[PDB]
Amino acid sequence: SQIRQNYSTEVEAAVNRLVNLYLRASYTYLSLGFYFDRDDVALEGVCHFFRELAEEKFEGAERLLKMQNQRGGRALFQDLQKPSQDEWGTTLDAMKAAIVLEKSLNQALLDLHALGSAQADPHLCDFLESHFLDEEVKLIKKMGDHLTNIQRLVGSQAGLGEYLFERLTLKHD
Amino acid sequence: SQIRQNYSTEVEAAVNRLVNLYLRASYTYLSLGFYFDRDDVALEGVCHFFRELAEEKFEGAERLLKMQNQRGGRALFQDLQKPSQDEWGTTLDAMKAAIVLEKSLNQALLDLHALGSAQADPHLCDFLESHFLDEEVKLIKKMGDHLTNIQRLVGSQAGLGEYLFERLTLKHD
Amino acid sequence: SQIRQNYSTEVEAAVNRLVNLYLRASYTYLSLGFYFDRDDVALEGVCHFFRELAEEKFEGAERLLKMQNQRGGRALFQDLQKPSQDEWGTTLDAMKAAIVLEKSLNQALLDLHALGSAQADPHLCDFLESHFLDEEVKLIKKMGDHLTNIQRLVGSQAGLGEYLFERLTLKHD
Amino acid sequence: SQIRQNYSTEVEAAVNRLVNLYLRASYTYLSLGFYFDRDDVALEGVCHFFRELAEEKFEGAERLLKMQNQRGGRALFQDLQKPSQDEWGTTLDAMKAAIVLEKSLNQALLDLHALGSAQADPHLCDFLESHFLDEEVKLIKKMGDHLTNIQRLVGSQAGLGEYLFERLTLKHD
Ligand SMILES: [Cl-]
Ligand SMILES: [Cl-]
Ligand SMILES: [Cl-]
Ligand SMILES: [Cl-]
Structure with missing residues (x-):
């Protein structure tokens, strides 16, 4: 680009992949939230917890897309796979699935941080440290x-x- | 000292010992508090209860140090032993340990009050009665x-x- | 742990060591502060300066303990050695001792940052950069x-x- | 008296003596204060310090007189000797004289506390502890x-x- 500087194709692609993972996670949380709003499950606080996480994960994807453009890369969207389950069991089962999901996003963040470090891309590394790793x-x-x-x-x-x-x-309400 | 009056060496030393006991207690409560913040314990109200007590016990030590100087004695600090346990069990186990700890501080207060009484040091005795015994x-x-x-x-x-x-x-949040 | 991810035993142990160093420093500043409150020293602004630093160093230890739990490590407390001196001389002598103390904490921060970098632990490195290095x-x-x-x-x-x-x-006042 | 209870003649007399000592001290501080207002001394903050102490010592005498009546004793006033000096030297000389004066009042308080303790007069002892010893x-x-x-x-x-x-x-400004 006319603005692109120190921004590798490898990081650009991994950023697009990470957007897909965050949107997949957001969709998983939408499904979790509405499952707990079923009349035969009816756990409002659990529903709200997961709907809030759907929004948080979308906001992560949105920040990555803003950054992609700030750096001069090009957002590329792929199909979004449906969540892994249609019914999520008990609150325990759901919270276990969520921790598994979050560990997977965390490892993807760490992998991207390592790529950025290997490519001497400190803006990328700072971006993840400032808006994703501690969150x-x-x-x-x-x-x-x-x-x-x-x-x-x-x-x-x-x-x-x-x-x-x-x-x-x-929290409920 | 140029200000020291009716302040025995015995009381001065016992005051320094009591500072050590209060700081040891404060450190014990810091350990209790953070134990209950562990992800595999996760009892926020218990954590906050004990962290508040860490601060209360530190404030007791600080008041004793202020008084030592007000009287013309000299603060002398010693090594602070680590708490008696690294893991504190259940809330019940922890509350039992805390009551044992508090009874030990109380007996040290009573012993110091008795020394002050024996030494005809009414400022010392009043200080303990006003800021420690009822607390x-x-x-x-x-x-x-x-x-x-x-x-x-x-x-x-x-x-x-x-x-x-x-x-x-x-109290939690 | 059920949450531990990318958190080495080496970093976990160095974090516990650093807590000990910060609490030792806090205790040193408590002693400095009360020395300057002695009737035969009587430098209120110096006392307040060092008492404020006792609190700052404690807050550093508290942040490290919060982080240890956030990461899934386990806080382990050790005995806290008493300060290096019982009497601290002049304001100059005390300020010299404090700068020596702070350089020692700084080197411990830098050493831990280097370990984190070597272990590819960017959350650790960011934590130190954001809350300790510039402070x-x-x-x-x-x-x-x-x-x-x-x-x-x-x-x-x-x-x-x-x-x-x-x-x-x-400051006095 | 119709109200007197557990109030010895010995305490009643020592209270009257202590009033005399506090008024003597108040008069000493009046002289110190005005000395420092002399045009050839001219240290306003020193003058104000000692004039404030004249008022504090008078207020002590007034509290003792209130208490004497509360207990059913009878205030008896004696001649008040003039201060020990007409000229008070330097601020250092004056502050030395004041500390000597205060130690003398303190010993009189402690002596009266001991008499009260010996006479099993806890109201007297509490009164001194609450309004005089720590002050x-x-x-x-x-x-x-x-x-x-x-x-x-x-x-x-x-x-x-x-x-x-x-x-x-x-204090000046
Ligand atoms: Cl397609
Ligand atoms: Cl030692
Ligand atoms: Cl040990
Ligand atoms: Cl007469």
Whole structure:
């Protein structure tokens, strides 16, 4: 480009791939959120938690697209695969799937950071450090805290514990 | 000193010892607080309770140091031993350890009050009565109230009770 | 851990070591502060300067502990050695000791940054860059500015200069 | 009296003696204050410091008189001796005389506390602890801090140091 400088084709392509991963994650969270709004699941706080994450992941994709243009690369969109499940089980099952999803996004961020470091692209590396790495660490810690609280509440009364977690930890309304 | 009056070497030394005990207690509460912030423990209200106590105990040490100087004694600092445990078990185990810790500080306050009385040092005795004795009694009563509520919640569903205590009694977010 | 990702045992251990160093530094500043509150030293602005630094260093330790948990490592506390001196001499002597202390913390930060870089741990590296490296550079510059002003004020009237520095540069009030 | 209870003649008399000592001290501070307002001394901050202390000492006498009546004793006033000096020398000389005066009041408070303790008069003991003992300790610490700063400022330029202390430490504006 007329503005492109120190921006490799390898980073440009990995950025487009990462946009796809973030949009896939956003779509997964849309499905999780609406599952918990089903009349036969009915856990409002869990629904809201996952709908909020759908928006957060979309915003990540949007920031990557802004950056792609700021650097002179070209956004390229690919098909977005549907989420891995149509029904997400219990809050525990869903929170486990979300932590798996987030670890996968985190590894993709770390892989892209390493590519940027290898390509001597400090703007890329700073961008990820400033807007993605700590955001992801914070979210994974929150999800782990949630998992431990959900697990402690299973005991021998799973329904009671799932209700109490939704009412007393998750935001509702 | 040019200001020292009615201030025995015995009281001066016991004051320095008490500073060490309060800082040791503060450090114990720092460890308790961060244990409960672990992703595999995740009891925010318990963490906050103990972090608040770390600050309270530090403030006690600071008041003793201010007083030492007001009286013309000389602060002398010693090594601070690490807390007695690296992992603190359940909320019940932790609250039991805290009550044991507080009873030990209380006995040290009472011992110092008795030394002051024996040395006819009424400023020392008033200082402890005004800023430490009732504060400690109030805290031990609160901890006993907490212990009884934690114990009543164990029954046959320990995880459920530990979650409910943290959510409905301890401050969180 | 269930959340731990890209977090080496080497970094986890060095983080615990750094917490010990920050708490040791905090304790050193507590001793410096109270020394200057002695009736036979009586330099309020110097006392306040060092008590403020005790709090700053504690806050550094607290941030490291928060981060340790965010990453899935485990805080491990060790004994805290007492400060290197019981009496700190003149304001000049104290400011010299503080700059030596700060350079030692700075080198520990740089060493940990290098370990993080070697381990491809960009979250660690960003954390130090964002919350510690510049804070330390700013503080060392301030301390050097203070040292030069204290030194210029010694001349042939040391007491006069020590009073004037405390009154016209250091905060009191 | 119709209200007197647990109030010994020994305490009643010592209270009257202590009123005399506080009024004597108040008169000493009036003389110190006006000395420093002389056109050939002219240290406004020193004058104000001592005039404020004249009022503080009077207020102590007034509290003792209120208490004497609250307890059913009878105030008995005696002649008030003039201060020990007509001219008070330098700020250093004056601050030294004031610390000597305050130590004498402090010992009288401690002696009265001991008499009250010996007579099992806890209202007397509490009264002194609540309104006199710590007030006196705080004031003596302030005076010692002042003495150390005045002494550090003497060096080889006494006039310069006396001016700077009055301008930068004592209240004026
Ligand atoms: Cl296609
Ligand atoms: Cl040692
Ligand atoms: Cl050990
Ligand atoms: Cl007469």
